[PDB]
Amino acid sequence: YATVSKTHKTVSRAYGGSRCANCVKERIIRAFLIEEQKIVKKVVKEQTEAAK
Amino acid sequence: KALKVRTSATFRLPKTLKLARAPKYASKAVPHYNRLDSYKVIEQPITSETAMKKVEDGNILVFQVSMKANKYQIKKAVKELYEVDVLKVNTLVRPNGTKKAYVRLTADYDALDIANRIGYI
Amino acid sequence: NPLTHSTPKNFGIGQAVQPKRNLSRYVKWPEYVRVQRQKKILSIRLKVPPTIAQFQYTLDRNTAAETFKLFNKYRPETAAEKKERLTKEAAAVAEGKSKQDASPKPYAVKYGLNHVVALIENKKAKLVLIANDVDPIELVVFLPALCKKMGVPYAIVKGKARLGTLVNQKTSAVAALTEVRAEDEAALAKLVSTIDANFADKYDEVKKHWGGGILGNKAQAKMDKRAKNSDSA
Amino acid sequence: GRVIRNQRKGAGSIFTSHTRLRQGAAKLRTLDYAERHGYIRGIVKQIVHDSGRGAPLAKVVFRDPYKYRLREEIFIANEGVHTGQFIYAGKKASLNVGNVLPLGSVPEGTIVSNVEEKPGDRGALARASGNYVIIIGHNPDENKTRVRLPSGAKKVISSDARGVIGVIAGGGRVDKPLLKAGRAFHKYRLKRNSWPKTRGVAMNPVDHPHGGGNHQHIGKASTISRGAVSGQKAGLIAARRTGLLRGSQKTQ
Amino acid sequence: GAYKYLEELQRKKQSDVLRFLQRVRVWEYRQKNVIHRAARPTRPDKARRLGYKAKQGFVIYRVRVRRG
RNA sequence: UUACUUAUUCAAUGAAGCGGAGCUGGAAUUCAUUUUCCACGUUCUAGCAUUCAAGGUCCCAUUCGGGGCUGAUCCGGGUUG
RNA sequence: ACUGUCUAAUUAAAACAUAGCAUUGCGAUGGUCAGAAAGUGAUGUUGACGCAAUGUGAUUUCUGCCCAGUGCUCUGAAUGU
């Protein structure tokens, strides 16, 4: 793998020759929805400290 | 005052100054001469009936060389003593424990011309 | 402001790998550091006898300043000073028919333990400064008591190194004054009165005080809060 | 006589443990600040067979609190855990199967396993397959916890010692007969060397205290005292009763 | 001189001052190596009467032997 | 008989958060007023967490950069039992 | 019971082993064992569904009475040695 060019050991994507386009796909789903839920989890506690 | 800030829990040895050697007298006071110079590298040509066939046909000089010499020192010794550029050198240790080198010369030099320049036919 | 955004980190446990803090409290020292620290610690936790405890009853900084100011006036002759005086007296005895006495009588501090102890036994020293730092303390534990026996006033002062500086040694561990110029007899008398008031008058009641037995601050905290939660309700 | 076999067991030449294929020492996380002040969350990445052992092991990866790296610990898989589960290790963690908690923070009757003896020795008790201890009570002053060990022996231990909730997987293993000398061979092939242990009564008087005679018999009492000597301890050491146990052994 | 006072004082090994020193020093010597270099004699007169003189090339080594 | 930790013994850790006090939070009841106790950033999810840390503030001589405090409470240097 | 093993060079067996059964020690400051010692080791990268010590020898059906003797063992006893 040191004699061949870069395009034999990669695909053109994030996580190219490491992950497999379906584990990359669920990685983007999971990163988006939890960090969006963390935006919900911030302000849903900002009503409990505003109403206690 | 105050004490210094340590961001690690490990103590390692300080990088102290280590001085170079400045002796009051020489190590052995006379440098040795060249242990494996060009007359000691190649000792003697090999003139057996099949070694003589390599001189005529193979463009190869069969030399007996020193047991300490490597292929760089034999490529440099043949070039020094005979002023001949060398293609490749193949060496073996003979079953009487001495070394034999198959020095191949380039195509510019005729090994049979150098063979009777050295003085063996 | 413009495109630079204040994003604070969350260094609570579970998130956001902790920043580099001062772990000098938790650094695994070399073995000589730990031995030299817990040696002091062990000499504090143990109940010390009163004839060792009298050291760390050291002289106060103002009186120490005055004492080293007086003792700087009688610093002994240095090596180049001895060379210049040896030339200026050897020529004098050889030609000027002197009896090796065209050099005046020196006034200097006396030092070295055998010299100073022999001067105290002869009742010849007028003041004795005693170091508190000496690592075999058996060299100097008899120096208070002997000074109380002989009527020589003595002061335990911080620094064998500071005693060594006044005498051009490295350390000297004791220093004495036996003869003093008459321009300094009053200052020597006031310093001796302060030193008697601090050391020699206090000796026969200091001689009974066992020192040490001082707990560490975790055990100190534990003991005080045990006293404050049990009794004080 | 000569040196008998269980005295050769301790010199450790061929009687050491056959430890090539082991995955590692099964251990809890060390008591750092997160484990005793709040919690921390790891992921179980793999449930894996460890040779020489009946229980499966679980690689659980954690985030290093002080350095940007990952730390993989090798727990014993409690029954029910699955790869991909989030495991919560710490004082203020929740009472779920898989979460390792200190014993002071669990109610009485909690079924934990891999429970420490001293707080910080990373897992000592209830550690073979199927086993578990029962937290039976707390003494909150001088803070201690009475638990019941798998042998039925009760034990008071520290309330800061940790343990993972649940019982250890692979249980009910020994209910299947081996049926073969081959299965006992391959069983002890990855543990040590004591499979074919010839009865001491069939040996010679050099080889054992039981050997010899024109019949195969022990000759003297097979119950040997505790204050006996290495070389004599062949039989039932310090046996306080013998014969078939009829009645409730089953200590209260 | 001081060496007579030290010579007599190192004979009272049951007195309080010497047993406190023996406890502190027997901890400290136990903390170091079995054979380790001593920078100076702890008994300077006992060393001195056994032949020691404080000049270069006279060396003190402390050493620890198992009893019994 | 039961207490101490400093001898001794055991254990863990690239000796990382120990001990004491504070800060706001609230349970909490005030016979004067705050006399005490618990907290004191993480739990749908097989993602992610690193460049003295961004920001707030003060210097340097503004060129690109560099430093101090804070962010991240103080105190004791007993690594923790 | 089987498959298996052993007396190389007079005995291959009904002997040994075996699974199965049972008993015992032991919760780590531990059981069993090693070393002349040790800041030393085996079991142990272990933890009672485990390690160690023995007896019996698949399955079916059972395993009776005796603790006086000799052992082992006990939260015991006491005014004997």
Swiss-Prot record, chain A:
Q: Output the superkingdom of the source species.
A: Eukaryota
* Subcellular localization(s) per the UniProt record: Cytoplasm
Q: Which family does it belong to?
A: Belongs to the eukaryotic ribosomal protein eL34 family.
Any other noteworthy remark? Present with 23600 molecules/cell in log phase SD medium.
Instruction: Outline what the protein does.
Output: Component of the ribosome, a large ribonucleoprotein complex responsible for the synthesis of proteins in the cell. The small ribosomal subunit (SSU) binds messenger RNAs (mRNAs) and translates the encoded message by selecting cognate aminoacyl-transfer RNA (tRNA) molecules. The large subunit (LSU) contains the ribosomal catalytic site termed the peptidyl transferase center (PTC), which catalyzes the formation of peptide bonds, thereby polymerizing the amino acids delivered by tRNAs into a polypeptide chain.
The subunit structure is:
Component of the large ribosomal subunit (LSU). Mature yeast ribosomes consist of a small (40S) and a large (60S) subunit. The 40S small subunit contains 1 molecule of ribosomal RNA (18S rRNA) and 33 different proteins (encoded by 57 genes). The large 60S subunit contains 3 rRNA molecules (25S, 5.8S and 5S rRNA) and 46 different proteins (encoded by 81 genes).
Kindly provide the name given to this protein in its UniProt entry: Large ribosomal subunit protein eL34A
Q: Which organism is it from?
A: Saccharomyces cerevisiae (strain ATCC 204508 / S288c)
Q: What is the lineage of its organism?
A: Eukaryota, Fungi, Dikarya, Ascomycota, Saccharomycotina
What fragment of the full-length protein is this? 62 to 113 of 121
Curated annotation (Swiss-Prot), chain B:
Mind telling me which residue stretches traverse the membrane in this protein? Answer: none
Read off the InterPro entries from this record.
Nucleotide-bd_a/b_plait_sf, Ribosomal_uL23-like, Ribosomal_uL23/eL15/eS24_sf, Ribosomal_uL23_CS, Ribosomal_uL23_N
**Pfam families in alphabetical order:** Ribosomal_L23, Ribosomal_L23eN
Primary residence? cytoplasm
> Where is it located?
Cytoplasm
Keyword Cytoplasm annotated = yes
A GO biological process this protein is involved in? Answer: cytoplasmic translation
From the record heading this protein, give the residue positions of the covalent cross-link Glycyl lysine isopeptide (Lys-Gly) (interchain with G-Cter in SUMO).
K40
- Gene Ontology CC entries for this record: cytosol; cytosolic large ribosomal subunit; preribosome, large subunit precursor
Q: By its UniProt entry, which SUPFAM superfamilies does this protein fall under?
A: Ribosomal proteins S24e, L23 and L15e
Alphabetized, the UniProt keywords read:
Cytoplasm, Isopeptide bond, Ribonucleoprotein, Ribosomal protein, RNA-binding, rRNA-binding, Ubl conjugation
UniProt-recorded Gene Ontology molecular function terms: RNA binding; rRNA binding; structural constituent of ribosome
Describe the family membership recorded for this protein in Swiss-Prot or TrEMBL.
Belongs to the universal ribosomal protein uL23 family.
Q: Which NCBIfam families match?
A: PRK14548.1
Listed under subunit, the entry gives: Component of the large ribosomal subunit (LSU). Mature yeast ribosomes consist of a small (40S) and a large (60S) subunit. The 40S small subunit contains 1 molecule of ribosomal RNA (18S rRNA) and 33 different proteins (encoded by 57 genes). The large 60S subunit contains 3 rRNA molecules (25S, 5.8S and 5S rRNA) and 46 different proteins (encoded by 81 genes). uL23 is associated with the polypeptide exit tunnel.
What is this protein called in UniProt? Large ribosomal subunit protein uL23
From Swiss-Prot, chain C:
Top-level taxon of the source organism: Eukaryota
UniProt keywords (A-Z) are:
Cytoplasm, Ribonucleoprotein, Ribosomal protein
Please give the Pfam families that the UniProt record associates with this protein.
Ribosomal_L7Ae
Q: Which Gene Ontology terms describe the biological processes this protein takes part in?
A: cytoplasmic translation; maturation of LSU-rRNA
Name the Gene Ontology molecular function terms of this record. RNA binding; structural constituent of ribosome
The record's annotation in PROSITE patterns points to: RIBOSOMAL_L7AE
Gene Ontology CC annotation, any one: cytosolic large ribosomal subunit
InterPro entries in the cross-refs: eL8/uL1-like (IPR050257), Ribosomal_eL30-like_sf (IPR029064), Ribosomal_eL8-like_CS (IPR004037), Ribosomal_eL8/eL30/eS12/Gad45 (IPR004038), Ribosomal_eL8/Nhp2 (IPR018492), Ribosomal_eL8_euk (IPR001921)
In terms of one coarse class, where is the protein primarily found? cytoplasm
Is Ribonucleoprotein tagged as a keyword? Answer: yes
S-S pairs: none
Q: Where in or outside the cell?
A: Cytoplasm
Q: How does it assemble?
A: Component of the large ribosomal subunit (LSU). Mature yeast ribosomes consist of a small (40S) and a large (60S) subunit. The 40S small subunit contains 1 molecule of ribosomal RNA (18S rRNA) and 33 different proteins (encoded by 57 genes). The large 60S subunit contains 3 rRNA molecules (25S, 5.8S and 5S rRNA) and 46 different proteins (encoded by 81 genes).
The record makes one more remark, namely: Present with 238000 molecules/cell in log phase SD medium. There are 2 genes for eL8 in yeast.
**What is the similarity comment for this entry?**
Belongs to the eukaryotic ribosomal protein eL8 family.
Name this polypeptide is given: Large ribosomal subunit protein eL8A
Q: Which organism is it from?
A: Saccharomyces cerevisiae (strain ATCC 204508 / S288c)
Its gene is RPL8A
UniProtKB/Swiss-Prot annotation, chain D:
Subcellular location per the Swiss-Prot or TrEMBL entry: Cytoplasm
Q: Which GO terms describe its biological process?
A: cytoplasmic translation; maintenance of translational fidelity; ribosomal large subunit biogenesis
Modification sites for Phosphoserine? S51, S94, S158, S159, S248
Superkingdom to which the source organism belongs = Eukaryota
What keywords are assigned to this protein?
Cytoplasm, Isopeptide bond, Phosphoprotein, Ribonucleoprotein, Ribosomal protein, RNA-binding, rRNA-binding, Ubl conjugation
Looking at the keywords, is GTP-binding present?
A: no
Any one Pfam family match given in the protein's UniProt record, by short name:
Ribosomal_L2_C
Which terms in the GO cellular component ontology are assigned? cytosol; cytosolic large ribosomal subunit
Q: Which GO terms describe its molecular function?
A: RNA binding; rRNA binding; structural constituent of ribosome
Recorded hits in PROSITE patterns, A to Z, give: RIBOSOMAL_L2 (PS00467)
Family per similarity comment: Belongs to the universal ribosomal protein uL2 family.
According to the record's subunit comment, the protein's assembly and interactions are: Component of the large ribosomal subunit (LSU). Mature yeast ribosomes consist of a small (40S) and a large (60S) subunit. The 40S small subunit contains 1 molecule of ribosomal RNA (18S rRNA) and 33 different proteins (encoded by 57 genes). The large 60S subunit contains 3 rRNA molecules (25S, 5.8S and 5S rRNA) and 46 different proteins (encoded by 81 genes).
* Additional record remark: There are 2 genes for uL2 in yeast.
Q: What is this protein called?
A: Large ribosomal subunit protein uL2A
Originating organism: Saccharomyces cerevisiae (strain ATCC 204508 / S288c) (Baker's yeast)
